[PDB]
Design an enzyme around this catalytic site. Structure first.
Site, PDB file in Angstrom:
ATOM      1  N   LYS A  12      14.256  26.703 -25.512  1.00 19.72           N
ATOM      2  CA  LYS A  12      12.909  26.464 -26.006  1.00 19.72           C
ATOM      3  C   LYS A  12      12.903  26.284 -27.514  1.00 19.72           C
ATOM      4  O   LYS A  12      13.413  27.148 -28.259  1.00 19.72           O
ATOM      5  CB  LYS A  12      12.005  27.660 -25.663  1.00 19.72           C
ATOM      6  N   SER A  33      22.266  20.218 -40.415  1.00 15.23           N
ATOM      7  CA  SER A  33      22.978  21.343 -41.004  1.00 15.23           C
ATOM      8  C   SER A  33      24.465  21.094 -41.124  1.00 15.23           C
ATOM      9  O   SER A  33      25.098  21.524 -42.092  1.00 15.23           O
ATOM     10  CB  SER A  33      22.736  22.605 -40.175  1.00 15.23           C
ATOM     11  N   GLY A  43      12.862  21.856 -37.143  1.00 16.37           N
ATOM     12  CA  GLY A  43      12.473  22.545 -35.927  1.00 16.37           C
ATOM     13  C   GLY A  43      13.569  23.500 -35.503  1.00 16.37           C
ATOM     14  O   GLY A  43      14.681  23.474 -36.034  1.00 16.37           O
ATOM     15  N   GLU A  62      11.193  27.651 -42.872  1.00 20.46           N
ATOM     16  CA  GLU A  62      12.612  27.935 -43.065  1.00 20.46           C
ATOM     17  C   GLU A  62      13.434  26.709 -43.438  1.00 20.46           C
ATOM     18  O   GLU A  62      14.285  26.766 -44.310  1.00 20.46           O
ATOM     19  CB  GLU A  62      13.235  28.547 -41.797  1.00 20.46           C
ATOM     20  N   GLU A  63      13.205  25.603 -42.721  1.00 26.96           N
ATOM     21  CA  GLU A  63      14.087  24.441 -42.813  1.00 26.96           C
ATOM     22  C   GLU A  63      13.668  23.462 -43.893  1.00 26.96           C
ATOM     23  O   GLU A  63      14.518  22.840 -44.515  1.00 26.96           O
ATOM     24  CB  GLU A  63      14.182  23.698 -41.471  1.00 26.96           C
ATOM     25  N   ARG A  82      21.289  17.593 -24.342  1.00 32.46           N
ATOM     26  CA  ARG A  82      21.551  18.862 -25.011  1.00 32.46           C
ATOM     27  C   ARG A  82      20.810  20.045 -24.350  1.00 32.46           C
ATOM     28  O   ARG A  82      20.982  21.201 -24.761  1.00 32.46           O
ATOM     29  CB  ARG A  82      21.187  18.783 -26.501  1.00 32.46           C
ATOM     30  N   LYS A  83      19.981  19.739 -23.359  1.00 33.04           N
ATOM     31  CA  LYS A  83      19.287  20.746 -22.546  1.00 33.04           C
ATOM     32  C   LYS A  83      18.363  21.605 -23.379  1.00 33.04           C
ATOM     33  O   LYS A  83      18.450  22.839 -23.394  1.00 33.04           O
ATOM     34  CB  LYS A  83      20.287  21.592 -21.759  1.00 33.04           C
ATOM     35  N   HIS A  84      17.465  20.966 -24.095  1.00 32.96           N
ATOM     36  CA  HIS A  84      16.432  21.690 -24.793  1.00 32.96           C
ATOM     37  C   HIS A  84      15.070  20.992 -24.707  1.00 32.96           C
ATOM     38  O   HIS A  84      15.004  19.789 -24.399  1.00 32.96           O
ATOM     39  CB  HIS A  84      16.833  22.052 -26.230  1.00 32.96           C
ATOM     40  N   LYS A 126      19.326  10.872 -33.030  1.00 37.31           N
ATOM     41  CA  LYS A 126      18.181  11.670 -32.568  1.00 37.31           C
ATOM     42  C   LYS A 126      17.092  10.798 -31.928  1.00 37.31           C
ATOM     43  O   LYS A 126      15.933  10.853 -32.311  1.00 37.31           O
ATOM     44  CB  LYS A 126      17.573  12.497 -33.727  1.00 37.31           C
TER      45      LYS A 126
HETATM   46  O1  LIG Z   1      25.311  20.517 -33.179  1.00 39.40           O
HETATM   47  P1  LIG Z   1      25.059  21.735 -33.931  1.00 39.40           P
HETATM   48  O2  LIG Z   1      25.891  22.907 -33.399  1.00 39.40           O
HETATM   49  O3  LIG Z   1      25.381  21.738 -35.419  1.00 39.40           O
HETATM   50  O4  LIG Z   1      23.502  22.216 -33.806  1.00 39.40           O
HETATM   51  C1  LIG Z   1      22.477  21.443 -33.223  1.00 39.40           C
HETATM   52  C2  LIG Z   1      21.878  22.193 -32.041  1.00 39.40           C
HETATM   53  O5  LIG Z   1      22.811  22.297 -30.982  1.00 39.40           O
HETATM   54  P2  LIG Z   1      22.591  21.684 -29.557  1.00 39.40           P
HETATM   55  O6  LIG Z   1      22.454  20.209 -29.706  1.00 39.40           O
HETATM   56  O7  LIG Z   1      23.816  22.102 -28.826  1.00 39.40           O
HETATM   57  O8  LIG Z   1      21.367  22.305 -29.020  1.00 39.40           O
HETATM   58  C3  LIG Z   1      21.443  23.564 -32.532  1.00 39.40           C
HETATM   59  O9  LIG Z   1      20.917  24.301 -31.457  1.00 39.40           O
HETATM   60  P3  LIG Z   1      21.599  25.502 -30.745  1.00 39.40           P
HETATM   61  O10 LIG Z   1      21.628  24.897 -29.227  1.00 39.40           O
HETATM   62  O11 LIG Z   1      22.925  25.784 -31.218  1.00 39.40           O
HETATM   63  O12 LIG Z   1      20.702  26.741 -30.703  1.00 39.40           O
HETATM   64  C4  LIG Z   1      20.298  23.261 -33.521  1.00 39.40           C
HETATM   65  O13 LIG Z   1      19.607  24.440 -33.872  1.00 39.40           O
HETATM   66  P4  LIG Z   1      18.052  24.588 -33.619  1.00 39.40           P
HETATM   67  O14 LIG Z   1      17.714  24.404 -32.175  1.00 39.40           O
HETATM   68  O15 LIG Z   1      17.316  23.706 -34.507  1.00 39.40           O
HETATM   69  O16 LIG Z   1      17.857  26.088 -33.972  1.00 39.40           O
HETATM   70  P5  LIG Z   1      17.381  26.962 -35.284  1.00 39.40           P
HETATM   71  O17 LIG Z   1      18.695  27.562 -35.888  1.00 39.40           O
HETATM   72  O18 LIG Z   1      16.707  25.972 -36.236  1.00 39.40           O
HETATM   73  O19 LIG Z   1      16.430  27.975 -34.712  1.00 39.40           O
HETATM   74  C5  LIG Z   1      20.886  22.550 -34.747  1.00 39.40           C
HETATM   75  O20 LIG Z   1      19.878  22.325 -35.734  1.00 39.40           O
HETATM   76  P6  LIG Z   1      19.802  22.989 -37.157  1.00 39.40           P
HETATM   77  O21 LIG Z   1      18.631  24.005 -37.196  1.00 39.40           O
HETATM   78  O22 LIG Z   1      19.433  21.837 -38.016  1.00 39.40           O
HETATM   79  O23 LIG Z   1      21.105  23.552 -37.460  1.00 39.40           O
HETATM   80  C6  LIG Z   1      21.436  21.225 -34.320  1.00 39.40           C
HETATM   81  O24 LIG Z   1      22.045  20.585 -35.451  1.00 39.40           O
HETATM   82  P7  LIG Z   1      21.406  19.325 -36.200  1.00 39.40           P
HETATM   83  O25 LIG Z   1      20.366  18.805 -35.397  1.00 39.40           O
HETATM   84  O26 LIG Z   1      22.574  18.353 -36.498  1.00 39.40           O
HETATM   85  O27 LIG Z   1      20.936  19.850 -37.599  1.00 39.40           O
HETATM   86 CL   LIG Z   2      16.554  15.904 -30.012  1.00 39.77          CL
HETATM   87 MG   LIG Z   3      15.629  26.422 -37.805  1.00 40.64          MG
HETATM   88 MG   LIG Z   4      15.288  29.286 -35.522  1.00 43.70          MG
HETATM   89 MG   LIG Z   5      16.741  23.958 -36.516  1.00 48.07          MG
END
Ligand SMILES: O=P(O)(O)O[C@H]1[C@@H](OP(=O)(O)O)[C@H](OP(=O)(O)O)[C@@H](OP(=O)(O)OP(=O)(O)O)[C@H](OP(=O)(O)O)[C@H]1OP(=O)(O)O
Ligand SMILES: [Cl-]
Ligand SMILES: [Mg+2]
Ligand SMILES: [Mg+2]
Ligand SMILES: [Mg+2]
Ligand SMILES: [Cl-]
Length: 135
Positions: A12, A33, A43, A62-63, A82-84, A126
């Site tokens: 979520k 990141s 987000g 935060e971001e 990516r299952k979100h 994206k």
């Molecule tokens: O590929 P990766 O490991 O570098 O990270 C992906 C994504 O992974 P996924 O695709 O497997 O879901 C992360 O989700 P996770 O599944 O690990 O929880 C997501 O964090 P998020 O949901 O936003 O969570 P918050 O930390 O903001 O709460 C992160 O966003 P960034 O916040 O900006 O780091 C993304 O990076 P990118 O979009 O390039 O910046």
């Molecule tokens: Cl996305």
């Molecule tokens: Mg964040």
């Molecule tokens: Mg967060």
């Molecule tokens: Mg994020």
């Protein structure tokens, strides 16, 4: 930060389209990141029992280092690969903070884009985020 999930196992998330004004012509994107040369919509994960609108506002603080007036829910968007599943809100930015959490901690950048340019830079990595702007 505790990750949370819908009943089908999708993570979520919540995000805002952070517009410079009520005209909704320019939007604030942030850098990825792990890949600073790419842009994303700010987000992140909803916390346990956290309302999606509260999560969205928290995440953009935060971001992206902004605060503002929360507007409408645009929609709920799935990334099947990516299952979100992300609740996406409009936010009209009224405060731009010079040092913010992700700038200090990970050197995250932010930039204003005309909507059509936001869509262009989001498309390759994206495409679901590009689709946030469809309506
Ligand atoms: O590929 P990766 O490991 O570098 O990270 C992906 C994504 O992974 P996924 O695709 O497997 O879901 C992360 O989700 P996770 O599944 O690990 O929880 C997501 O964090 P998020 O949901 O936003 O969570 P918050 O930390 O903001 O709460 C992160 O966003 P960034 O916040 O900006 O780091 C993304 O990076 P990118 O979009 O390039 O910046
Ligand atoms: Cl996305
Ligand atoms: Mg964040
Ligand atoms: Mg967060
Ligand atoms: Mg994020
Ligand atoms: Cl605007």
């Amino acid at each position: 930060q505790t990750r949370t999930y819908d009943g089908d196992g999708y993570k979520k998330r919540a995000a805002c389209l952070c517009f410079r004004s009520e005209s909704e012509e320019e939007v604030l994107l942030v850098s990825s990141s792990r890949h600073p040369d790419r842009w994303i919509v700010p987000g992140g994960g909803m916390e346990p029992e956290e309302e999606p609108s509260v999560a969205a506002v928290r995440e953009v603080c935060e971001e992206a280092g902004v605060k503002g007036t929360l507007g409408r829910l645009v929609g709920i968007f799935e990334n099947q690969e990516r299952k979100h599943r992300t609740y996406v809100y409009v936010l009209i930015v009224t405060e731009v903070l010079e040092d913010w959490e992700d700038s200090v901690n990970i050197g995250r950048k932010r930039e204003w884009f005309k909507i059509e340019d936001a869509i262009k830079v989001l498309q390759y990595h994206k495409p679901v985020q590009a689709s946030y702007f469809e309506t």
